Design an enzyme around this catalytic site. Structure first.
Site, PDB file in Angstrom:
ATOM      1  N   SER A  11       0.807  -1.212   0.000  1.00 26.71           N
ATOM      2  CA  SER A  11       0.000   0.000   0.000  1.00 26.71           C
ATOM      3  C   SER A  11       0.848   1.272   0.000  1.00 26.71           C
ATOM      4  O   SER A  11       0.361   2.334  -0.410  1.00 26.71           O
ATOM      5  CB  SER A  11      -0.920  -0.003   1.227  1.00 26.71           C
ATOM      6  OG  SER A  11      -2.105   0.693   0.933  1.00 26.71           O
ATOM      7  N   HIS A  38       7.923 -12.237  12.971  1.00 29.27           N
ATOM      8  CA  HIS A  38       6.603 -12.630  13.461  1.00 29.27           C
ATOM      9  C   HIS A  38       6.540 -14.064  13.977  1.00 29.27           C
ATOM     10  O   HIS A  38       5.490 -14.471  14.489  1.00 29.27           O
ATOM     11  CB  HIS A  38       5.550 -12.440  12.358  1.00 29.27           C
ATOM     12  N   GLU A  88      12.400 -18.059   5.747  1.00 27.25           N
ATOM     13  CA  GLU A  88      11.738 -19.318   5.446  1.00 27.25           C
ATOM     14  C   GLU A  88      12.714 -20.332   4.845  1.00 27.25           C
ATOM     15  O   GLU A  88      13.701 -19.976   4.193  1.00 27.25           O
ATOM     16  CB  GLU A  88      10.524 -19.087   4.529  1.00 27.25           C
ATOM     17  CG  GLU A  88      10.849 -18.844   3.059  1.00 27.25           C
ATOM     18  CD  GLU A  88       9.617 -18.531   2.203  1.00 27.25           C
ATOM     19  OE1 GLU A  88       9.552 -17.415   1.627  1.00 27.25           O
ATOM     20  OE2 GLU A  88       8.727 -19.411   2.100  1.00 27.25           O
ATOM     21  N   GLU A 124       1.471 -19.319   4.757  1.00 30.82           N
ATOM     22  CA  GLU A 124       1.743 -20.173   3.600  1.00 30.82           C
ATOM     23  C   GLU A 124       1.508 -21.647   3.865  1.00 30.82           C
ATOM     24  O   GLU A 124       1.920 -22.470   3.042  1.00 30.82           O
ATOM     25  CB  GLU A 124       3.178 -20.025   3.103  1.00 30.82           C
ATOM     26  CG  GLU A 124       3.573 -18.673   2.675  1.00 30.82           C
ATOM     27  CD  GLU A 124       4.660 -18.149   3.558  1.00 30.82           C
ATOM     28  OE1 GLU A 124       4.469 -18.189   4.806  1.00 30.82           O
ATOM     29  OE2 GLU A 124       5.708 -17.738   3.001  1.00 30.82           O
ATOM     30  N   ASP A 156      14.999 -18.402   2.012  1.00 34.64           N
ATOM     31  CA  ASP A 156      14.700 -16.978   1.876  1.00 34.64           C
ATOM     32  C   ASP A 156      15.149 -16.288   3.162  1.00 34.64           C
ATOM     33  O   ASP A 156      14.473 -16.361   4.196  1.00 34.64           O
ATOM     34  CB  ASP A 156      13.219 -16.725   1.602  1.00 34.64           C
ATOM     35  CG  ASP A 156      12.852 -15.226   1.670  1.00 34.64           C
ATOM     36  OD1 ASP A 156      13.760 -14.374   1.559  1.00 34.64           O
ATOM     37  OD2 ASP A 156      11.655 -14.905   1.842  1.00 34.64           O
ATOM     38  N   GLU A 209      17.539 -16.668  -1.424  1.00 38.51           N
ATOM     39  CA  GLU A 209      16.787 -15.487  -1.814  1.00 38.51           C
ATOM     40  C   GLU A 209      16.998 -14.377  -0.782  1.00 38.51           C
ATOM     41  O   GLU A 209      16.998 -14.630   0.430  1.00 38.51           O
ATOM     42  CB  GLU A 209      15.284 -15.799  -1.956  1.00 38.51           C
ATOM     43  CG  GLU A 209      14.347 -14.528  -1.909  1.00 38.51           C
ATOM     44  CD  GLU A 209      12.839 -14.859  -1.828  1.00 38.51           C
ATOM     45  OE1 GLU A 209      12.428 -15.923  -2.355  1.00 38.51           O
ATOM     46  OE2 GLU A 209      12.064 -14.055  -1.233  1.00 38.51           O
ATOM     47  N   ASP A 244      14.314 -10.432  -4.377  1.00 38.31           N
ATOM     48  CA  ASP A 244      12.889 -10.203  -4.151  1.00 38.31           C
ATOM     49  C   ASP A 244      12.659  -8.771  -3.660  1.00 38.31           C
ATOM     50  O   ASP A 244      12.197  -7.902  -4.416  1.00 38.31           O
ATOM     51  CB  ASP A 244      12.348 -11.226  -3.142  1.00 38.31           C
ATOM     52  CG  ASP A 244      10.899 -10.932  -2.692  1.00 38.31           C
ATOM     53  OD1 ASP A 244      10.089 -10.396  -3.478  1.00 38.31           O
ATOM     54  OD2 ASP A 244      10.566 -11.267  -1.537  1.00 38.31           O
ATOM     55  N   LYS A 270       6.157 -11.187  -9.159  1.00 40.25           N
ATOM     56  CA  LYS A 270       4.886 -11.020  -8.452  1.00 40.25           C
ATOM     57  C   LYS A 270       3.987 -10.122  -9.287  1.00 40.25           C
ATOM     58  O   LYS A 270       4.211  -8.905  -9.348  1.00 40.25           O
ATOM     59  CB  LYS A 270       5.109 -10.453  -7.050  1.00 40.25           C
ATOM     60  CG  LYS A 270       5.882 -11.406  -6.144  1.00 40.25           C
ATOM     61  CD  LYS A 270       6.274 -10.789  -4.797  1.00 40.25           C
ATOM     62  CE  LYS A 270       6.966 -11.827  -3.900  1.00 40.25           C
ATOM     63  NZ  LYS A 270       7.329 -11.304  -2.523  1.00 40.25           N
ATOM     64  N   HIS A 290       3.811 -16.466  -5.338  1.00 38.62           N
ATOM     65  CA  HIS A 290       2.565 -16.120  -4.664  1.00 38.62           C
ATOM     66  C   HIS A 290       2.770 -14.895  -3.772  1.00 38.62           C
ATOM     67  O   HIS A 290       3.861 -14.320  -3.697  1.00 38.62           O
ATOM     68  CB  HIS A 290       2.068 -17.312  -3.838  1.00 38.62           C
ATOM     69  CG  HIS A 290       2.966 -17.675  -2.684  1.00 38.62           C
ATOM     70  ND1 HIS A 290       4.331 -17.467  -2.699  1.00 38.62           N
ATOM     71  CD2 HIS A 290       2.698 -18.275  -1.499  1.00 38.62           C
ATOM     72  CE1 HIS A 290       4.860 -17.896  -1.566  1.00 38.62           C
ATOM     73  NE2 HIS A 290       3.888 -18.381  -0.816  1.00 38.62           N
ATOM     74  N   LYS A 296       6.986 -20.738  -6.785  1.00 36.76           N
ATOM     75  CA  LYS A 296       7.055 -20.590  -5.332  1.00 36.76           C
ATOM     76  C   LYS A 296       5.651 -20.205  -4.893  1.00 36.76           C
ATOM     77  O   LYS A 296       5.225 -19.060  -5.079  1.00 36.76           O
ATOM     78  CB  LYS A 296       8.076 -19.543  -4.913  1.00 36.76           C
ATOM     79  CG  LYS A 296       8.115 -19.262  -3.412  1.00 36.76           C
ATOM     80  CD  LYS A 296       8.971 -18.016  -3.118  1.00 36.76           C
ATOM     81  CE  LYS A 296       8.759 -17.525  -1.696  1.00 36.76           C
ATOM     82  NZ  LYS A 296       9.921 -16.737  -1.162  1.00 36.76           N
TER      83      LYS A 296
END
Lengths: 447, 459, 447, 459
Positions: free
Chosen positions: A41, A158, A167, A208, A249, A297, A324, A349, A377, A400
């Site tokens: 945003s 998080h 990840e 995910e 990642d 990544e 990314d 993306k 995704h 992915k």
């Protein structure tokens, strides 16, 4: 045939937050429908989705996250510009809509409004021509089923565990078909869950559909993952049959202070945590030597281009180096990453750039230059499976799109199974495992 | 128009296990497609899905969970029997396939092969008639948007916490439209997730997209729920504007030992391993458990309790319905397993005033509609239910509207396997708003309750 | 598909009085046609049909009973509002038309004008979709053929005999199929006529095609009816095979003076006649004990709600208590009858409420609350058979549509035979006899 | 276009006895459906309907009156012979089915099975051509709306009253349009019912929806009729505005004993059981009965008399037509039973100047049209007639207009089995008003009368 109707509505994404769905109809009876995934945003680098902040809609949903304004932009502004145009003219429609918004980051009408129309238009045309979408997008020759990057273990800010890396993924390489590669992934995922329960870890899932158990360090997680691959009957590594690799990642922008990288959760737990760029590059080569990691990544921070360039030059011949946060599917940033040899691979993306034609332009630029384009995704997703047809249409060789639970991920694997079925009868389905890494000058044996 | 093609394939469900998808084509150009949810493989009471155990397919997927045998049964046995029949004849098709299988529990061909064809046939007939599925299933008059039972807190066998009850749910009652009720559930859900993080609880999700935080007791979980409702700006209760009620699935077969109910996770947390429960602090006969429910009902706005007693404890149910059935919903799930003969028994014994409806527990659409109609005629509510293993298929949204169930149970507010159903209800609400009327009537859906009271009232 | 044409005309009903017929056409070729039955012209409780009183049409027909004004309202007012709407949107059309009239009892345009359109629209949609009407109205699952209430013996003010009760009916219960139940009714009806001729009674018929012979008392009529059932080979009673029950419509508002019930014709003949509410309730239990009466309609007066409530509480567990004049298919009065436990069953008359959607709302309210909804004919009828498809669509289990002569009744039984034939091949046809009375807590043996 | 499907079923007629309905479908999408009225089962002169006597079906309905054998004959014998033929070839179809049965009176397959197919075929051909049935049957030019013969007063065998004549009818002559003539009949009918109640007569109806009050004589009934016409605002008579005439069906075969006509209900009312009629007060030879008709004709506006003499008394008919045939309609019904060979005899002997036409007495549509055409060519009127057992089928309305009969006989003004035919005539009148012209010519339809006179004139 001519577009007769364009209509948008507000629904919910897989995290319980609003998103937009767009339907397109054509005179000949075509129907196309698409759901936009969640995006940024704010930011000065990517196409911007439009939320209901500071509107009469703001209180509709938690966090003012409604997208009725974008829905209004589709129904009131975009639709009358588009109705009466031939739906098969994807590039014209996309270009029409970009100019209608008139800002470079699509901030006025919303990247989510613009992508929704862009994708629904393409699906309507494919439906009208009675062609699978990957055929409409790619022509007669697509056959390459992509190697999946399956999230299994999650870290970062998080996650309450002690993994500062974001990840960990498995990649099923040594298999003859996509079906068999997915079966192997299904075996590793369920055996992974069984082992985690056996050792007293939690088996609930995140956005995910992967796990975030209470591991104490990267090394423990990588050890656990290697063992689960062995328990399932497969070989951790790159080459040979039943080979299953790992991809990471790091999301290194998140633990960078402008001068040093800090494994903050590991450091807090102990109450090596700090790395400059060269020391971080050293840690990776340690992991790369011990564990079968084929792909890293965001190994360095978005503002640490010198770290990236040295990463790519020291291990990029033999390992995938993915941008990314570095590139955010931005064609101009991609040109600089190509020119400066910072990466050999990029996440794609759709909703970071805003239209299908621009996405295809970005994919083609990456591949022409010898990089792989990993179709990705988002965190907030839906049963829309566009990215499965996109990965086959462009021969990405890699996708992915999540772990092996939640329909927001599972639907994409199901769509690949339906595509594989279609190619088995009316064409040829190809799964080439380790050979998708055409960006790696040499791929060696991990042992 | 005539069915021309029936094709099934194996895909994955939302837990990563194989399930079956069936496509049906008609000569007029109709296309219908359905995905079967996860079900039971063994059991003496419900329709049985067929897995690939002890077949050449057993090694395909983890746990021998493939469904290629059922896929072969659709493609090789059911399809040639069904092609050439008019797709509009739902009851004929379902009857033919039931007879083709020949076993009462659908064990030979598989309840999953049978339901997949049953639903795809109906969707193809709706698609060819250019009607939404709920208009095809229900006629001209359906307008009732159902109240959702939204999972939020999970306990029971597989949750590491100290909750012995299996799930807690919110129901947004005091709202004018379905959209507004769903907005309220959205606000409670994200505020609940924020409060949980604020107190250091985990916020990952389970199979239905709700939370299983490390709560110490039913009361601690229920207190947290009440405060989340208030923090979101709503009133915990039954009547009036902005009311949000609570529902519980105790799943009490899981902690019944044959004689007493034992809060076994709660007891394993207090007592060391060498200790017996000499005071019977964590044990309950039927009446003692009924007294415990009464305590929770007095303090908390619990409008509905599912499987409060064990499947074999018919007496406990009969006493439960006797004491609180006028003012509270009493749901059978494991008690009834969508079995028409067991529902007749429950009706005759006055065991429940509500039943969960699971398409794949009975195995065809026509039998499901028979079962719903029998429940409603007898003054019970029929709550259209999801399964643990799910897909983007949204049949149960259309089904709930088609039969005016008034209540649906399809999970928390995350994961597409649950979210798609709420999205389908938003699309159905939009369709009814322009071409008819959408009714959301909140607490009025409990026509099975003789007297719904004010929760804040002193009883 | 879109409605292209709506046209109304004045024809005659089965009593020789004007009524309205409406045709509807759609763009896709659908055609629907409906004929409104006769209803009330005054009253403050029901939807009001519009006659030609005090118009330029008044002298067209006897008694100023023309309906050209209603025809003009359809052709001039309702039709242009409705043309161009999709015919499958029954609830929208019904709601459109209610608002267009704008009065609660449909007095401005006429309940007969409004119902005619409402029903023709639904038939046009069903015709377009190539579906029997009961499937369009009910969805995929309807199978229940209703138990008929067949008028056989008639009393009341307009009958010259000494029966103050309005009508006596037979109900064929103990049979496996609708065809067999209708065959049994055909045998009782013709044997009844043969016995009446043998005893010197008249065998001409009234408005419902039943008989009004010169019986001296209720008891004599009930005796005669029991004997005819036995003569035909069946058993008067509720349970068992070949069971045939009796139902009564007392129409008790007609012999109530505000304080007492007076069997006026019986009293005049004798030149017990007077009953307060409790004494009338006592007379019923006498009849209920002696004869196999499963159902009593309008047992008490419309203004004697206390009589109804006590009736329902004393015999409502074992007998059907039907409201007609009490409720006039009025949803608000129905809610009070439900709340006060005054009845366990209600007559449904489409033209007393005015539209199909409202009728379905009323049926659903009655059934949800545990009452039966008996779909009823009117005195003035036609070959329209809507109510046969309606009774199957909503699983009423009971229909009341006349004796076994005159096409104005016979057509409905023929339509049930055609529906039974359709369900026998393409579905399942169910006739459950005594089990339709789900509103009766216990059904006992009459012997 | 080609016939693709012919299906028959058993339903009920307006007297509650079984009859047969046949549906016909064509490849072009035409659908036609017909319901056969009640007819004769035995008899040596007319086409014979087949009932279920001495079959496995005999016990289905009261009186062994089922028609399943005829239904089976349509579905198993006639349908395979007819499918594949072009539906527009009415005469071919009717010829094929006549030959298929092979018996002159249609006894083998049943006149009801044959007529049902004959009519459904024609309706399907009209339906596929998007033509009203009367335009299909009659060509471009039909415009003549028929004058109705409306039953109002009934007597004869089964009526408890003292009328030996079987029925009395009104005919609304002096009106500009068919709608106005029907409005006049509506007014006479309800005013007649009011006058009857006013005098304490019964007002229930019989098979044709008219009255059978307890009148004492033909004169009393005829007087009542005349006053009802006047009370309604019309003039009893033949000529001029608002004229309403009377017609009678004496059905004199029913009170002929072989030698004399006996008013046997009238005599049983005067004479006790031990008494003979020594004065011959209630007996009549042919000439004496002709004198009695002459008396009624002089005093009452009787325009038409049907079956004035017995079926075997050809001489009585010939003398009747000789004396009053120039000024009055003389109809054969039982005399002729829609039999072409008997009509040739009646034409040759000058026995009648009018004949009733009953589709199911001859058995196909083409033979009915042959019979009508022969009657009209010979200067007779052809009155299209209903039966006692009827349905909502309205073929005879279209038939009457198609052949310009000018007169129809289809019952009183109650019961849908009669009312539907008047309603069909109102729809045909509406069709002709916008796309052609509707003619109602009143008394001018009696082209068979050499000199119609003024009734009020002294003769």
């Amino acid at each position: 045939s001519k577009i007769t109707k364009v209509f948008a509505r507000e629904i919910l994404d897989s995290r319980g937050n609003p998103t937009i769905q767009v339907d397109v109809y054509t005179l000949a009876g075509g129907f196309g429908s698409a759901i936009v995934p969640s995006g940024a945003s704010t930011g000065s680098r990517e196409a911007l989705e439009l939320r209901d902040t500071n509107t009469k809609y703001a209180d509709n949903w938690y966090g003012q996250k409604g997208v009725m304004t974008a829905v209004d932009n589709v129904n009131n502004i975009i639709a009358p510009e588009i109705i009466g145009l031939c739906c098969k003219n994807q590039r014209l429609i996309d270009q029409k809509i970009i100019e209608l918004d008139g800002t470079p980051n699509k901030e006025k009408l919303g990247a989510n409004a613009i992508l929704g129309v862009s994708l629904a238009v393409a699906k309507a045309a494919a439906n009208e021509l009675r062609m699978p979408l990957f055929r409409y997008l790619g022509g007669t020759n697509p056959t390459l089923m992509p190697v999946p990057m399956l999230n299994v273990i999650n870290g970062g800010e998080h996650a309450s565990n002690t993994l500062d890396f974001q990840e960990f993924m498995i990649m099923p390489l040594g298999f003859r078909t996509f079906k068999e590669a997915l079966q192997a992934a299904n075996k590793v995922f369920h055996n992974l869950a069984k082992l985690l329960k056996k050792s007293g870890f939690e088996t609930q899932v995140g956005d995910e559909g992967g796990f975030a158990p209470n591991f104490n360090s990267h090394e423990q997680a990588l050890d656990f993952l290697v063992d689960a691959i062995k328990e399932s009957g497969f070989n951790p590594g790159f080459k040979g049959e039943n080979a299953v690799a790992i991809a990471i990642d790091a999301a290194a922008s998140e633990f960078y202070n402008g001068q040093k990288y800090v494994f903050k959760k590991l450091k807090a737990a102990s109450l090596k945590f700090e790395f400059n760029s060269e020391e971080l590059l050293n840690y990776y080569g340690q992991l790369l030597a011990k564990y079968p990691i084929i792909s890293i990544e965001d190994g360095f921070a978005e503002s640490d281009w010198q770290g990236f360039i040295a990463f790519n030059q020291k291990y990029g011949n033999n390992h995938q180096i993915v941008g990314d946060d570095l590139t955010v599917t931005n064609v101009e940033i991609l040109k600089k990453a190509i020119n400066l040899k910072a990466i050999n691979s990029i996440l794609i993306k759709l909703n970071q750039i805003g239209t299908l034609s621009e996405t295809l332009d970005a994919i083609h630029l990456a591949q022409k230059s010898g990089m792989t384009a990993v179709i990705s995704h988002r965190s907030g997703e839906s049963e829309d499976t566009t990215i499965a047809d996109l990965a086959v249409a462009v021969s990405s060789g890699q996708i992915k799109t999540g772990s092996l639970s939640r329909t927001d991920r599972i639907a994409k694997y199901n769509r690949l199974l339906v595509i594989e079925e279609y190619l088995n009868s009316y064409a040829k389905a190809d799964y080439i495992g380790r050979e998708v890494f055409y960006n790696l000058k040499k791929l060696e044996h991990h042992h």
